[PDB]
Amino acid sequence: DTMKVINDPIHGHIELHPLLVRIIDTPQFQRLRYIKQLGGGYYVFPGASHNRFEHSLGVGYLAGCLVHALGEKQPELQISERDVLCVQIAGLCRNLGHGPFSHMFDGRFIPLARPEVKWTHEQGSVMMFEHLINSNGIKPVMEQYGLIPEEDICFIKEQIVGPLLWPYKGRPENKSFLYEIVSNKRNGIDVDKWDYFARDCHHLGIQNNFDYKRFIKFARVCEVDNELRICARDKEVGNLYDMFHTRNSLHRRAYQHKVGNIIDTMITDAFLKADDYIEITGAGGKKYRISTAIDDMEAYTKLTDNIFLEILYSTDPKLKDAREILKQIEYRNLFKYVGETQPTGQIKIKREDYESLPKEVASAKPKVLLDVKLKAEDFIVDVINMDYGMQEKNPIDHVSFYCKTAPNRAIRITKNQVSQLLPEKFAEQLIRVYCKKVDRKSLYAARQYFVQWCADRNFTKPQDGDVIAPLITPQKKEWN
Amino acid sequence: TMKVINDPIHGHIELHPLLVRIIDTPQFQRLRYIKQLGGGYYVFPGASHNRFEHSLGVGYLAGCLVHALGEKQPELQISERDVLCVQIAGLCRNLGHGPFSHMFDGRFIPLARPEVKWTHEQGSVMMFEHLINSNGIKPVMEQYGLIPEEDICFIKEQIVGPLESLWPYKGRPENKSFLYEIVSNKRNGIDVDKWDYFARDCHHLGIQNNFDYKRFIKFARVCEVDNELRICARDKEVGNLYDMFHTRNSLHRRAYQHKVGNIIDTMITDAFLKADDYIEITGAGGKKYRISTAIDDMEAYTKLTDNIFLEILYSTDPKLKDAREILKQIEYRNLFKYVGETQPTGQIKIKREDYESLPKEVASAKPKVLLDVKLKAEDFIVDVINMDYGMQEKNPIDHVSFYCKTAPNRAIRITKNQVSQLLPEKFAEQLIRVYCKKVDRKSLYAARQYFVQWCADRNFTKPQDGDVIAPLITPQKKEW
Amino acid sequence: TMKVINDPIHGHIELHPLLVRIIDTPQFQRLRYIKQLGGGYYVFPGASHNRFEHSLGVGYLAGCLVHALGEKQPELQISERDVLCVQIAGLCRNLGHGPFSHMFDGRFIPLARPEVKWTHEQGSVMMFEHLINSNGIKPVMEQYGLIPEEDICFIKEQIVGPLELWPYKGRPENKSFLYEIVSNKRNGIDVDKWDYFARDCHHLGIQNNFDYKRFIKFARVCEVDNELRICARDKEVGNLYDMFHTRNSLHRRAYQHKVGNIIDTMITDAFLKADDYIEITGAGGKKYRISTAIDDMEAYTKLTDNIFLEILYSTDPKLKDAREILKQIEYRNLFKYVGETQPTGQIKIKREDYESLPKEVASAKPKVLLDVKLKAEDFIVDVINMDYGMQEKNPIDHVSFYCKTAPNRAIRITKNQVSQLLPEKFAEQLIRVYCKKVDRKSLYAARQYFVQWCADRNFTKPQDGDVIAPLITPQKKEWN
Amino acid sequence: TMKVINDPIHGHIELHPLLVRIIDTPQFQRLRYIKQLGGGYYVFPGASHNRFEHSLGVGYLAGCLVHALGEKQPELQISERDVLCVQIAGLCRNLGHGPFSHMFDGRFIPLARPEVKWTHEQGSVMMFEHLINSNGIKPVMEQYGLIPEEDICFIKEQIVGPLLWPYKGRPENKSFLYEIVSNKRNGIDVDKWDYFARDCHHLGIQNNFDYKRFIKFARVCEVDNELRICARDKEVGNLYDMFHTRNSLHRRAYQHKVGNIIDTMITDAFLKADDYIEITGAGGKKYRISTAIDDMEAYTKLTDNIFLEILYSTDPKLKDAREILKQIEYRNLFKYVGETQPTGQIKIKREDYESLPKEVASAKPKVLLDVKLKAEDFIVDVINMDYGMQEKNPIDHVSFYCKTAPNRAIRITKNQVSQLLPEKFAEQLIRVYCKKVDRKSLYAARQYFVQWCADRNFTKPQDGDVIAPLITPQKKEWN
Ligand SMILES: Nc1nc2c(ncn2[C@@H]2O[C@H](COP(=O)(O)OP(=O)(O)OP(=O)(O)O)[C@@H](O)[C@H]2O)c(=O)[nH]1
Ligand SMILES: Cc1cn([C@H]2C[C@H](O)[C@@H](COP(=O)(O)OP(=O)(O)OP(=O)(O)O)O2)c(=O)[nH]c1=O
Ligand SMILES: Cc1cn([C@H]2C[C@H](O)[C@@H](COP(=O)(O)OP(=O)(O)OP(=O)(O)O)O2)c(=O)[nH]c1=O
Ligand SMILES: Cc1cn([C@H]2C[C@H](O)[C@@H](COP(=O)(O)OP(=O)(O)OP(=O)(O)O)O2)c(=O)[nH]c1=O
Ligand SMILES: [Mg+2]
Ligand SMILES: [Mg+2]
Ligand SMILES: [Mg+2]
Numbered sequence A: 001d002t003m004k005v006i007n008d009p010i011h012g013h014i015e016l017h018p019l020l021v022r023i024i025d026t027p028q029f030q031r032l033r034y035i036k037q038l039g040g041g042y043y044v045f046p047g048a049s050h051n052r053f054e055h056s057l058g059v060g061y062l063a064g065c066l067v068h069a070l071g072e073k074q075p076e077l078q079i080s081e082r083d084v085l086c087v088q089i090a091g092l093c094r095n096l097g098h099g100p101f102s103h104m105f106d107g108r109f110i111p112l113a114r115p116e117v118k119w120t121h122e123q124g125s126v127m128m129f130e131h132l133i134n135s136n137g138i139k140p141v142m143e144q145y146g147l148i149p150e151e152d153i154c155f156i157k158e159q160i161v162g163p164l165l166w167p168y169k170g171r172p173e174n175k176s177f178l179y180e181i182v183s184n185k186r187n188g189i190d191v192d193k194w195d196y197f198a199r200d201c202h203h204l205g206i207q208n209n210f211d212y213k214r215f216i217k218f219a220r221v222c223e224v225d226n227e228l229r230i231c232a233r234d235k236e237v238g239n240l241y242d243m244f245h246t247r248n249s250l251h252r253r254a255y256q257h258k259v260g261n262i263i264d265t266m267i268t269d270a271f272l273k274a275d276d277y278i279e280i281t282g283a284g285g286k287k288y289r290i291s292t293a294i295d296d297m298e299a300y301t302k303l304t305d306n307i308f309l310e311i312l313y314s315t316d317p318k319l320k321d322a323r324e325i326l327k328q329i330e331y332r333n334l335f336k337y338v339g340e341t342q343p344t345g346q347i348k349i350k351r352e353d354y355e356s357l358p359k360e361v362a363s364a365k366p367k368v369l370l371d372v373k374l375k376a377e378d379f380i381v382d383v384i385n386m387d388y389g390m391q392e393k394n395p396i397d398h399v400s401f402y403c404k405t406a407p408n409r410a411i412r413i414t415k416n417q418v419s420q421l422l423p424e425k426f427a428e429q430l431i432r433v434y435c436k437k438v439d440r441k442s443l444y445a446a447r448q449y450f451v452q453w454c455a456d457r458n459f460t461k462p463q464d465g466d467v468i469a470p471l472i473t474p475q476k477k478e479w480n
Numbered sequence B: 001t002m003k004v005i006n007d008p009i010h011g012h013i014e015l016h017p018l019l020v021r022i023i024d025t026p027q028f029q030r031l032r033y034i035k036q037l038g039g040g041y042y043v044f045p046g047a048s049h050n051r052f053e054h055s056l057g058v059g060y061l062a063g064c065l066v067h068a069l070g071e072k073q074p075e076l077q078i079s080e081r082d083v084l085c086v087q088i089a090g091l092c093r094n095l096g097h098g099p100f101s102h103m104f105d106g107r108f109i110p111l112a113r114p115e116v117k118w119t120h121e122q123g124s125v126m127m128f129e130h131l132i133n134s135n136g137i138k139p140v141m142e143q144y145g146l147i148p149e150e151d152i153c154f155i156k157e158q159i160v161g162p163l164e165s166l167w168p169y170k171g172r173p174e175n176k177s178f179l180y181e182i183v184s185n186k187r188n189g190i191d192v193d194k195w196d197y198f199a200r201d202c203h204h205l206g207i208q209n210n211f212d213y214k215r216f217i218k219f220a221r222v223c224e225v226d227n228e229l230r231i232c233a234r235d236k237e238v239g240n241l242y243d244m245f246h247t248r249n250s251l252h253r254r255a256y257q258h259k260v261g262n263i264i265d266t267m268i269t270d271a272f273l274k275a276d277d278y279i280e281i282t283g284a285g286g287k288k289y290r291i292s293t294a295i296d297d298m299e300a301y302t303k304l305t306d307n308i309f310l311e312i313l314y315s316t317d318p319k320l321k322d323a324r325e326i327l328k329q330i331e332y333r334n335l336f337k338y339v340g341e342t343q344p345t346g347q348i349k350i351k352r353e354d355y356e357s358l359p360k361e362v363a364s365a366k367p368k369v370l371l372d373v374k375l376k377a378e379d380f381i382v383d384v385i386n387m388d389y390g391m392q393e394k395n396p397i398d399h400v401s402f403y404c405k406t407a408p409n410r411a412i413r414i415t416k417n418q419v420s421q422l423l424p425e426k427f428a429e430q431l432i433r434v435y436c437k438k439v440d441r442k443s444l445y446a447a448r449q450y451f452v453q454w455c456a457d458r459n460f461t462k463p464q465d466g467d468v469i470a471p472l473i474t475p476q477k478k479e480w
Numbered sequence C: 001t002m003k004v005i006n007d008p009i010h011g012h013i014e015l016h017p018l019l020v021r022i023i024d025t026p027q028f029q030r031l032r033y034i035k036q037l038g039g040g041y042y043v044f045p046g047a048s049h050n051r052f053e054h055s056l057g058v059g060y061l062a063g064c065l066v067h068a069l070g071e072k073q074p075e076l077q078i079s080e081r082d083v084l085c086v087q088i089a090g091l092c093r094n095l096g097h098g099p100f101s102h103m104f105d106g107r108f109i110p111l112a113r114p115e116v117k118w119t120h121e122q123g124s125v126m127m128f129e130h131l132i133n134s135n136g137i138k139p140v141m142e143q144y145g146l147i148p149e150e151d152i153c154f155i156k157e158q159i160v161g162p163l164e165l166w167p168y169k170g171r172p173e174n175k176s177f178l179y180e181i182v183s184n185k186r187n188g189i190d191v192d193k194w195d196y197f198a199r200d201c202h203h204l205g206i207q208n209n210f211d212y213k214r215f216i217k218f219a220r221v222c223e224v225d226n227e228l229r230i231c232a233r234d235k236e237v238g239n240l241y242d243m244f245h246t247r248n249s250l251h252r253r254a255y256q257h258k259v260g261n262i263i264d265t266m267i268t269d270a271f272l273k274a275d276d277y278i279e280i281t282g283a284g285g286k287k288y289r290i291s292t293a294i295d296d297m298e299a300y301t302k303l304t305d306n307i308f309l310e311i312l313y314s315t316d317p318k319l320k321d322a323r324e325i326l327k328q329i330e331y332r333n334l335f336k337y338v339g340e341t342q343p344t345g346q347i348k349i350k351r352e353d354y355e356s357l358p359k360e361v362a363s364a365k366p367k368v369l370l371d372v373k374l375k376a377e378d379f380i381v382d383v384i385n386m387d388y389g390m391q392e393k394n395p396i397d398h399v400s401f402y403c404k405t406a407p408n409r410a411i412r413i414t415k416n417q418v419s420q421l422l423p424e425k426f427a428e429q430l431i432r433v434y435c436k437k438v439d440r441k442s443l444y445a446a447r448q449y450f451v452q453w454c455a456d457r458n459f460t461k462p463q464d465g466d467v468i469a470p471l472i473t474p475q476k477k478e479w480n
Numbered sequence D: 001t002m003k004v005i006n007d008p009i010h011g012h013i014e015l016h017p018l019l020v021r022i023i024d025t026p027q028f029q030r031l032r033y034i035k036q037l038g039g040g041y042y043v044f045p046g047a048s049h050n051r052f053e054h055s056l057g058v059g060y061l062a063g064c065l066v067h068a069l070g071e072k073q074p075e076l077q078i079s080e081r082d083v084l085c086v087q088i089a090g091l092c093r094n095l096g097h098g099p100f101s102h103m104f105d106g107r108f109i110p111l112a113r114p115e116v117k118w119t120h121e122q123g124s125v126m127m128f129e130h131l132i133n134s135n136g137i138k139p140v141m142e143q144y145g146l147i148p149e150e151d152i153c154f155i156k157e158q159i160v161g162p163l164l165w166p167y168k169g170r171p172e173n174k175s176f177l178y179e180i181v182s183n184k185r186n187g188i189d190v191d192k193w194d195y196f197a198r199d200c201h202h203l204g205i206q207n208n209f210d211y212k213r214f215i216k217f218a219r220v221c222e223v224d225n226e227l228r229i230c231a232r233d234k235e236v237g238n239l240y241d242m243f244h245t246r247n248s249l250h251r252r253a254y255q256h257k258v259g260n261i262i263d264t265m266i267t268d269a270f271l272k273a274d275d276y277i278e279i280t281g282a283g284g285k286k287y288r289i290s291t292a293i294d295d296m297e298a299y300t301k302l303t304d305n306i307f308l309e310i311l312y313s314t315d316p317k318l319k320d321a322r323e324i325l326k327q328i329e330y331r332n333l334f335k336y337v338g339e340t341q342p343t344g345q346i347k348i349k350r351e352d353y354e355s356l357p358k359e360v361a362s363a364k365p366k367v368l369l370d371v372k373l374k375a376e377d378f379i380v381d382v383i384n385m386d387y388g389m390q391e392k393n394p395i396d397h398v399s400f401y402c403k404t405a406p407n408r409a410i411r412i413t414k415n416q417v418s419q420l421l422p423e424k425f426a427e428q429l430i431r432v433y434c435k436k437v438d439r440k441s442l443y444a445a446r447q448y449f450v451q452w453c454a455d456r457n458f459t460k461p462q463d464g465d466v467i468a469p470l471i472t473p474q475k476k477e478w479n
Helices: A019-024 A027-034 A039-043 A051-071 A080-091 A105-113 A120-134 A138-142 A148-162 A173-180 A191-204 A212-217 A234-255 A258-274 A304-312 A317-330 A351-363 A440-456 B017-023 B027-033 B038-042 B050-071 B081-092 B102-110 B120-133 B139-141 B148-160 B174-180 B192-205 B215-217 B235-256 B259-275 B307-314 B320-330 B350-366 B441-457 C017-023 C026-033 C038-042 C052-074 C078-093 C102-112 C120-133 C138-144 C148-160 C172-180 C190-203 C212-217 C234-254 C258-272 C306-313 C317-330 C353-363 C440-456 D017-023 D024-033 D038-042 D051-072 D081-094 D104-112 D118-133 D137-143 D146-162 D172-179 D191-203 D211-216 D235-255 D257-273 D305-312 D316-329 D350-362 D438-456
Strands: A006-007 A013-017 A219-226 A227-233 A337-340 A379-387 A401-403 A406-411 A427-435 B004-006 B011-015 B219-226 B230-233 B335-340 B381-386 B403-404 B406-413 B428-437 C001-007 C013-015 C220-226 C227-233 C336-341 C379-387 C401-403 C404-409 C427-435 D003-007 D011-015 D218-222 D224-233 D337-340 D378-386 D400-402 D403-410 D425-432
Touching: A006 A051, A006 C017, A006 D211, A013 A019, A013 A051, A013 A427, A013 D081, A013 D211, A013 D400, A019 A138, A027 A051, A027 A120, A027 B320, A039 A105, A039 A191, A039 A258, A039 B148, A039 C401, A051 A080, A051 A191, A051 A219, A051 B038, A080 A120, A080 A173, A080 B307, A080 B441, A080 C017, A080 D137, A105 A120, A105 A258, A120 A148, A138 A148, A148 A173, A148 B081, A148 D218, A173 A227, A173 B081, A173 B428, A191 A212, A212 A219, A212 A234, A212 D003, A212 D011, A219 A406, A219 C306, A227 A234, A234 A379, A234 A401, A234 B192, A234 C234, A258 A304, A258 A317, A258 A337, A258 A379, A258 A427, A304 B307, A317 B027, A337 A440, A351 A379, A379 D003, A401 B403, A406 C379, A427 B017, A427 D146, B004 B050, B011 B017, B011 B050, B011 C212, B017 B027, B017 B081, B017 B139, B027 B050, B027 B120, B038 B259, B050 B192, B050 B219, B081 B120, B081 B174, B081 B335, B081 D011, B102 B120, B102 B259, B120 B139, B120 B148, B139 B148, B148 B174, B174 B230, B192 B235, B215 B235, B215 C001, B215 C013, B219 B406, B230 B235, B235 B403, B235 D235, B259 B307, B259 B320, B259 B335, B259 B381, B259 B428, B307 B320, B335 B441, B350 B381, B350 B441, B350 C102, B428 B441, C001 C052, C017 C026, C017 C078, C017 C138, C026 C052, C026 C120, C026 D316, C038 C102, C038 C258, C052 C078, C052 C212, C052 C220, C078 C120, C078 C148, C078 C172, C102 C120, C102 C258, C120 C138, C120 C148, C148 C172, C190 C212, C190 C234, C212 C220, C212 C234, C220 C404, C227 C234, C234 C379, C234 C401, C258 C306, C258 C317, C258 C336, C306 C317, C306 D172, C306 D305, C317 D024, C317 D316, C336 C440, C353 C440, C427 C440, D003 D051, D011 D017, D011 D051, D011 D337, D017 D081, D017 D137, D024 D051, D024 D118, D038 D104, D038 D257, D051 D081, D051 D191, D051 D211, D081 D118, D081 D146, D081 D172, D104 D118, D104 D257, D118 D137, D118 D146, D118 D337, D137 D146, D146 D172, D172 D224, D191 D211, D191 D235, D211 D218, D218 D403, D224 D235, D235 D400, D257 D305, D257 D316, D257 D337, D257 D378, D257 D425, D305 D316, D337 D438, D350 D438
Parallel strands: A227 A401, B230 B403, C227 C401, D224 D400
Antiparallel strands: A006 A013, A219 A227, A337 A427, A379 A427, A401 A406, B004 B011, B219 B230, B335 B428, B381 B428, B403 B406, C001 C013, C220 C227, C336 C427, C379 C427, C401 C404, D003 D011, D218 D224, D337 D425, D378 D425, D400 D403
């Protein structure tokens, strides 16, 4: 084996070490070719054809870039080629656990199909990685290139999912900075974002990307509270605030697009309807369901966006209901968007409260004459938590900086030191309401319920409120 | 009414409601599940794009061109009816593509059904009819002022040429002849399909080359040529046109005919042939078809996409074992091995009927070198690629009409000699790639000896690595 | 005939012959010799671009917007005459810029001629008048159907606002929306920004811009307060906030770059020193100074970045002091950046106070031993007002929107209806301090004065404060 | 410490302190005031870029290549000293360019000072010497481990070639280093790589060569008894494409008919101003635009500024020069008449160039003309278009290697690649312009021009049947 070059449209020509190639050329990794990065987003942004596979290559490459840069700049860190490869592998493999349509699977389907279990794509990535290593005899190949499987497989898993006092076993405290590259638990500034910003923008057809190359050139390792951490140059602080602003922009415009979400919702509904009747064969010929394939990696290996088409193309009558929903997607007969609002002030909505919300909307009594009367089951309520990655916290408060005059001395920089034009809050909730009845009269009624409900709950006035519900909006004194 | 879509290539494009109705059908949406470049994605990880988004682009550019001509030359009497028909033809010219695009019509069908002659273009017309009839489009066409009898004919003619002189078209008369040059230009191949795929494929492939269609549109005009109204280019654009075809040739050499992309397409085709007996696709009336016969029924063909690849890969039926095994080898990157490339010298051209014999010929070569292993015809694959400027031996620029700034209504011809001596002296050639199914080191060495000997025996060109792969053979040929 | 130009930002643009005639004059061609970003080029080597190409872009976008509105809403009665007037205003709104753009109106003139109030906008109107009269344009305007009396008034009003109830004479109230295109006095959303965002980013090497093409597609004219105004679709509100965020980012990183500014400051200083000795010939053979060329357009026509080189290459001993400063720029022996701070709370710094500030810093009395003692004249204090274009106000409160369900009904959208992640203030001040003595000991001293002076005035703690002034920062409890 | 700078083409690049010191001098900064494409800006409004930023790019790419080779092949013994010398050469290879770049060496000097043979390359070496000596760089070079005697020689040799192994700056084992900045063997060098990307970015054409790909597949192998840079066999197509792109750029942009004529007008103005402009050089001595190349202190002050000095002048002696520049501003340019090429064997010699306007005026078109034109009314511009090696194919002078034997250099012939490639690699374009711009003069000039083409058996101009319908029928060959 020798090193391979591959042309990526985002990064150009990148080199891949033979070990990485061996990892890539497996059913477990190749599976990522058949999972869309943005799931239902493609049905809104026709440029967004990209899959997890190419994103993974980018993440692995950037992980390598960062660790190489640090090693060249600071030999004293004692970064070894062994270290570099482990970081690249973690980067490559951090997306291994994603399921059909990416966040839809993790975010919508599994929570509804298997409420008892707690599952995340991160956990899946670690399990898949284990399966990949074992199924394809990788450990011998790792030792051939100087890796120590016991320590290094631990290290790689830890980089992806965190710890399985210094809580890490894969590397010691002096190599702490290595854990900040692939998946940064401290502040979320990592190479995964850097790739998806550039990649998604290229495919979506939008600007606003983050300059990671610049950032890498000004990154350094310094001691902070007896730990070696990656620090940014002071002047980059504005760029970091911009980075998270960009993330928020991308989520508003693309990843949480009202219609993209509704399509994901419909797909999830179809999957629930099909869950009983689809069988996926796993280890030992044993059969699993869409919802239980996460228990067996051999079965999960076979679980991709394909299932969408399996259902769509099915002829079995048991799958009729599921198939019908997907057909409605093709005809673009989607559930209709009614509107969006937000909680005012201190109110926050708990996940346990989510199931009640359609009931609440149907319970509203708008003082308007209606031809039709709608029920809880006719409404969909989608609650979206928008933040800078750290719930209420400002991630920049958890970044360490250094200045030109003392490169080894780490410092903190507060928001007030940067700008008054920055956000005063770093978390919020969006509530979108849709109606399953698409007819004109139903839709009119749904708007009356929706706006009334917003008023009843003292939520923010929807932007089109005066148009969609002119009779309702005047009642609320606050609104005008 | 109008829908706006963000396309990463063209930006925000408007779509007329009629076009939206056509798009929102199973027949059109199917194009989301067919890769533009098929196996190319397995070589260029940026090339995740599907036929769907390319189709939008072609339809939009078709509209751009016809609009531009109408603004510039009102006397042409171009109607909104005309504009819509051209846009529909642009949208729908890719409807007939099958799994992995050119693989299907280029490799699979010719081998699976040799008696039949089938092209994606014919498929597009049949699919279009099925789309119209299945979704009640004709009433909607009339609603927007189209005349289905004439206009459906016109649209089909734009895609496939005459359905049968002097004037062979029924959809529009001679005065509107220029309209037939927009979507699919049979005269010289200069059309909006190429313009979109150049820009789109380069964006996704990661290569900066493309053709400036926007410039070209600004200098395009309609003039009378031989009693026909034709689109003419400004004289100064002649160099850019030669460059356009050069770009096309570059793209084919580097990407579309990439040695490994082709071999992957070949393996997939082989797997499909092995699965053809056992896969069933349900068409009209519940009747079952095979991969190779789904082209007979559009309802079945509607369900025939890249999905089939995964159906086979994930199958457990033992009858599909052989097919499934081939696809598994693809995932492990255990591909048939590239041996080399050569070209015919001088007079000789290779006929399609000769294609079967070629592996036999290579196995029949007797290299004068000691070999551990002896290879057979069945161990070789020979892939013959015709590279040209779209018109076999002819120069497409000889079939372009120009005009000059001093007499915009007077059409002229421009010969190659009037432009440059740095242009090609031929416009067609053949590439011959040889692969070996036995991948082991000793087999591979042997295959190289057969190959190079064969080239010498047939007076083909010396392979570029010939002195390295077959140092004992190359000296025998004095020419080399 | 129409002329076509290839602009790297917009591609191939058509220009009406009238516009070409305006462009092909000394008054317009002068813009080739004025850098868009002045001293910025000395920090961003990509930023070679001049006012000339930016002007073409603004003119073209002005045309795009007005064309789009006309096509969408014929009832507006927009005439080709209207379209040309808007394009001319767009082309000519940058005519009044002087050497190094904002340096000239922002730094040089205020210091050279404090009694006078002068702006590039005023200059643009005067230059335009001179251009028209010097080159016999009025006859050509009439040839293409313009009415010079009304239309020249209209064009000047678009650039500078009312030349003084409907306050405009160039067009009536029904055409009020036309005044929002080139230079939008109501909220600053205009085509000038749209071009410079894209152009500067292309040249600077920053991937950010605003998608004006999207915005244009969703723009409409509606009646607001008995005036016809351009309204944006409700869903674009987030993009508008993003637009102003991008503007702020660009000012922070590029237009107010600490070094770019100091270079502009040095150039200004050199100009002041040369002002007495340079002569520029204006109308009647008559001589003016850099600072008085603004009084005569014939002289101002000859006033460009050239003067920089005139001084640099001079041999006259009277120009020695000026020439020496420019030489220091070439050797990169610049005044040294000491640091940046901001006023706390609601403290604001008045323009009249600016001269006193260097004195205040020299007066500070840091409790540290210093080898050297610095004086007011050794300090430069640069006060930068950063806002969203409307001082304290939020421009989005002065935008009108419409919704999908009632396109003719204008609405307002408050910040609270959009997001809590938006800024709570829309204006702030940055204070940069530099030292004219560049030696190590002087620089160390300057840092102590600076930080002490921040503490004394309860300004924000400089980002590197603990490093540059470790003995000073502990005294201030607030800081830590 | 290293300086980081943002270049729109390459992104954020690091510069070694020594390189910064070289850059921060009047001799280098002067390149900010010289347009990369001269008169091209007056056709492509994107092309505002100057030699300065291009020079940074070339220096950076020179560094990239040498770094890549060193990492891949430690056995080459490439030292940091070597890397810096290559970067400096890259930075400084454009130092010798004059007002409006190629206009100055290509048009002005040849006419102003025919006896002298001058090239920007020679200027770059002289400027470099002046830069080093004026700014005390040698001490700074030794501070960073360079050996000025050997290394300054090496740098000059990289720019201009030699001043048996003919190089003194480095020995035969380091021969590959001379192929990076300015490749005399086949023209494949980092200068091109930067200007392709840079010019395309500014021009607004999406054309280009992937140098990053190429660097990844470049290797050093022994060829003859010389260590040379070799390309992977599979890159051969890309190399042919590279030169095709170069040709495309020259046709569409660098030799644009109008960009050339503007350059020609500016040159004419400079000739008219040459007597009356004075530039102060060493010892307070005065030079002319045409003699400033003799003194680097004067040449340092010679930039695109001179264009504006003339334009803004009020001295009556500069009236004629000033008037020409004014015509440029009004867009009252000399008019393009047409373009043709020589047929078959024929080539046009440089000595023949002065006669050409006379020949065109001597043509006797059989058409009635209101006005009669003279030699002085015509401009004839002969452009040699080639792949950088006159008649030769540069790819015949490239060495390749194959994946199965990376240390074994090979040759690859055109026939082994494709029959769609060019059969010739050099040609000549002949553009004719007229100084009389009125409609009737133009019409006349077209008749002279086309007649002249026919008389000389040159190729039929593309618009010939339109501009000279009465002339084209006479020539049977044409039709
Ligand atoms: N007029 C003009 N054109 C410019 C300018 N900058 C770039 N151009 C481009 O230069 C091209 C060629 O210049 P032209 O003025 O057309 O010269 P020409 O074609 O020989 O003369 P025309 O017959 O008048 O077109 C034009 O097509 C423009 O696209 C400018 O400042 N003024
Ligand atoms: C041939 C070629 C490939 N590529 C891309 C496609 C691949 O993603 C990547 C590497 O492709 P190749 O350079 O074709 O690599 P290869 O492994 O096929 O050739 P070999 O093994 O025989 O060295 O580069 C280009 O971008 N341009 C080109 O001209
Ligand atoms: C919202 C949004 C969409 N897009 C893209 C995605 C889609 O391809 C296209 C349409 O997006 P939208 O404008 O959101 O279209 P919509 O149908 O959701 O809105 P409406 O309620 O008016 O019908 O624009 C952007 O590029 N930027 C954006 O901010
Ligand atoms: C601040 C900034 C600069 N730049 C560009 C401008 C310059 O070409 C290059 C370096 O700019 P800076 O990073 O500002 O470098 P500096 O020398 O001004 O900072 P310091 O001296 O304090 O280390 O990067 C960006 O591209 N983005 C940015 O956000
Ligand atoms: Mg919609
Ligand atoms: Mg022209
Ligand atoms: Mg600095």
